[PDB]
Design a protein around this ligand. Structure first.
Ligand SMILES: Cc1cn([C@H]2C[C@H](OP(=O)(O)O)[C@@H](COP(=O)(O)O)O2)c(=O)[nH]c1=O
Ligand SMILES: [Ca+2]
Length: 129
């Protein structure tokens, strides 16, 4: 997989973000994770975490997997990096998302993410508290 440029337009919630990619505005849905909705427990905290991470970044990048690049809603499906650190993995590492929506052929970072989830769970962090 390959990292590609993008620029933040706006944080949305824990696992969605509006980015400009190839010069067009797009809503991106993070691959392989599920954050609680803003209206659920840890929902606000997940939103805040993603927001800080992408807003503070000097450099945003998107990384597509091998399979589908847009979902049925027209959202881009990618791994998102802020200054080289993967937002998807960081959410899971902090117990602010569960590994989820693991579809065949769009699952390159599955094992990295499950390892992060095990650690967050061992630490009883956030959703695992
Ligand atoms: C993360 C992801 C979600 N989706 C779809 C499945 C779910 O459909 P439904 O809307 O029918 O539940 C929805 C979950 O996204 P959200 O967690 O943003 O709601 O997005 C994909 O199709 N591919 C993906 O890789
Ligand atoms: Ca969600």
């Amino acid at each position: 997989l390959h990292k590609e440029p993008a620029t933040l337009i706006k944080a949305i919630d824990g696992d969605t973000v509006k980015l400009m990619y190839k010069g067009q505005p797009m809503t991106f849905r993070l691959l392989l994770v599920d954050t609680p909705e803003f209206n659920e427990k840890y929902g606000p905290e997940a939103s805040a975490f993603t927001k800080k991470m992408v807003e503070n970044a000097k450099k945003e990048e998107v990384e597509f997997d091998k399979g589908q690049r847009t979902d049925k809603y027209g959202r881009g499906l990618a791994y998102i990096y802020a200054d080289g650190k993967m937002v998807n993995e960081a959410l899971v590492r902090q117990g602010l998302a569960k590994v989820a929506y693991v579809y065949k052929g769009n699952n390159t970072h599955e094992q990295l993410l499950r390892k992060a989830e095990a650690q967050a769970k061992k630490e009883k962090l956030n959703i695992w508290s």
